[PDB]
From a paper:
To study the mutational tolerance of an antibody Fv, we selected 135 positions in the anti-lysozyme antibody D44.1 for deep mutational scanning. We also noticed a surprisingly large cluster of eight positions at the vL-vH interface where affinity-enhancing mutations occurred, although they were not in direct contact with the antigen. Our study demonstrates that improved interactions across the vL-vH interface may result in substantial optimization of a range of essential parameters for antibody development, including expressibility, stability, and affinity.
We iterated sequence design and backbone and sidechain minimization to promote the acceptance of even radical mutations yielding design D44.1des with eight mutations. To determine what molecular factors might underlie higher affinity in D44.1des, we expressed the design as an antigen-binding fragment (Fab) and determined its structure by X-ray crystallography in the absence of lysozyme. Despite eight core mutations, the overall agreement between D44.1des and the bound structure of D44.1, which served as the starting point for designing D44.1des, was excellent: The two structures deviated by <1 Å backbone root-mean-square deviation (rmsd) and in side-chain residues comprising the lysozyme-binding site. The mutations apparently improved various molecular aspects of the vL-vH interface including interface packing, solvation, and backbone rigidity. The main difference between the two structures was localized to the backbone conformation of CDR H2: Whereas H2 in the unbound structure of D44.1 adopts a conformation that would sterically overlap with lysozyme in the bound structure, the H2 backbone of D44.1des moves away from this position such that, even in the unbound state, the design is sterically compatible with lysozyme binding. Although it is possible that the observed conformational differences among the structures are due to differences in crystallographic conditions, we note that the mutation Trp47HTyr in D44.1des is incompatible with the observed H2 conformation in the unbound state of D44.1 and may induce the observed change in the design’s backbone conformation. Hence, the structure-based analysis suggested that the design of the vL-vH interface based on the bound antibody structure might increase the compatibility of the CDR backbones for the ligand while simultaneously improving stability. D44.1des exhibited nearly tenfold improvement in affinity (KD of 15 versus 135 nM for D44.1des and D44.1, respectively), with a 25-fold slower off-rate (8 * 10−4 s-1).
Author numbering:
A (entry chain H): 1 to 132, 138 to 218
B (entry chain L): 1 to 214
Write the structure that this text describes.
């Protein structure tokens, strides 16, 4: 059962270096190539290069000679790609695949964000239902980096939820909304909490969303 | 290198219909042409290998064809699970290259949006900023015009839109339009309006509030 397992998301300041791992399992590590691809948001796949673990032979797409550096360790069945002198152009999802002629077995993907911004948690503001089916929600504003999660009433409310993709603002900070449609009659007699969590700053916020008086 | 060119870039299909996506190569690549499907936040998944040969675990409705520099992926009777991005990939030479992709959307009855407008909270105001929010909910197709009017003045580059992927229940879209103004500017005007134009509306729907009224 061949399986490739990549490492977690990474957020670095420009000019830093990052190393992404690809842990193979299910076969002799040193007999198949490990190939690396870069995919930018809403874009195609781009070949970085590839390594043969045991020999350590390497090929590099000429575009990435400066940027990427492949290493491997046979002992721990793990391949590495090191991206150096980072810039925002390196913001992308990085994949590793086993060389099978075709790419049958892929790693799950690694998100690399490169940005000036610094870790900041969001402010959460009510989207308050109208003065006259209703909609309410939470505005999750000015945070860094991705991601934030939003549940409603600790997950007892999921029907009719929409949590938009974040938009990156001029400030380098992200902003996001989550909305839910509910019965009109319920708005006076009930409680609606949006449970926001931004792990990179330990922001856990449970915001009451009520119609204004 | 080898350049791979896919067309169309976009296709809406209603389930049961059949589609042929095209992939053209800049020079010959033998039969080392493969097809991949990729869903959101997922690694691509091998669909057809070696121009036309079956791949383990892939539904039979997918099939690939072609020769020389002209290849096709066919989906006999598309299903609702087949939304996503479709790439061809060559492996005849290094570097490996991929086409631009075709986004397969699922086509569906036209659904007008429900429109809702949200004034900025008081909390956010005290901190210097007003985010006014317009929600267009559960509509299809994707094209929609959202027009902000502040005291009937038509707003320009002071808003950002954000759209969901096709809903997993009814294949609709939802989008948010966020007007962002300074507290000062927001408090220079009374009547904040969001005007939505969409195929399923006989005329534009306007949602508004007045800062003078709770």
């Amino acid at each position: 059962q061949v399986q490739l397992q990549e490492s977690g998301a990474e957020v670095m300041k420009p000019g830093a270096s990052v190393k992404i791992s690809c842990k193979a399992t299910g076969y002799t590590f040193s007999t198949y190539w490990i190939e690396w691809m870069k995919q930018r948001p809403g874009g195609g796949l781009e070949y970085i290069g590839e390594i043969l673990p045991g020999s350590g032979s390497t090929y590099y797409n000429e575009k990435f000679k400066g940027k990427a550096t492949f290493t491997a360790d046979t002992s721990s069945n793990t391949a590495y790609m090191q991206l150096s002198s980072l810039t925002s152009e390196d913001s992308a999802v990085y994949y590793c695949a086993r060389g099978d002629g075709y790419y049958k077995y892929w790693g799950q993907g690694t998100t690399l964000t490169v940005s000036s911004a610094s870790t900041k948690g969001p402010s959460v503001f009510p989207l308050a239902p109208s003065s006259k089916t209703a909609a309410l929600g939470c505005l999750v504003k000015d945070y860094f980096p991705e991601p934030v999660t939003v549940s409603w009433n600790s997950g007892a409310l999921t029907s009719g939820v929409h949590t938009f993709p974040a938009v990156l603002q001029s400030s380098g900070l992200y902003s996001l909304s989550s909305v839910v449609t509910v019965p009109s009659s319920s708005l006076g007699t009930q409680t609606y909490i949006c449970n926001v969590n931004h792990k990179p700053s330990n922001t856990k916020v449970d915001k009451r969303v009520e119609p204004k008086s | 290198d080898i350049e791979l060119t896919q067309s169309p870039a976009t296709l809406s299909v209603t389930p049961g219909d059949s589609v042929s996506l095209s992939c053209r190569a800049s020079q010959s690549i033998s039969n080392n042409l493969h097809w991949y499907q990729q869903k959101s936040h997922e690694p691509p998944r091998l669909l057809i290998k070696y121009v036309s040969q079956s791949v383990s675990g892939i539904p039979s409705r997918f099939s690939g064809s072609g020769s020389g520099t002209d290849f096709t992926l066919s989906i006999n009777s598309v299903e609702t699970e087949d939304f996503g991005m479709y790439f061809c990939g060559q492996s005849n030479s290094w570097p490996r290259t991929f086409g631009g992709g075709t986004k397969l959307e699922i086509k569906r009855t036209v659904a007008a949006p429900s429109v809702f407008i949200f004034p900025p909270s008081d909390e956010q105001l005290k901190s210097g900023t007003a985010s006014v929010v317009c929600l267009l909910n559960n509509f299809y197709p994707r094209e929609a015009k959202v027009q902000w009017k502040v005291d009937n003045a038509l707003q320009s580059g002071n808003s950002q839109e954000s759209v969901t992927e096709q809903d997993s229940k009814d294949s609709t879209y939802s989008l948010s339009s966020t007007l962002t103004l300074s507290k000062a500017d927001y408090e220079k005007h009374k009547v904040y309006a969001c005007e939505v134009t969409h195929q399923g509306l006989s005329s534009p729907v306007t949602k508004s509030f007045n800062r003078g009224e709770c």
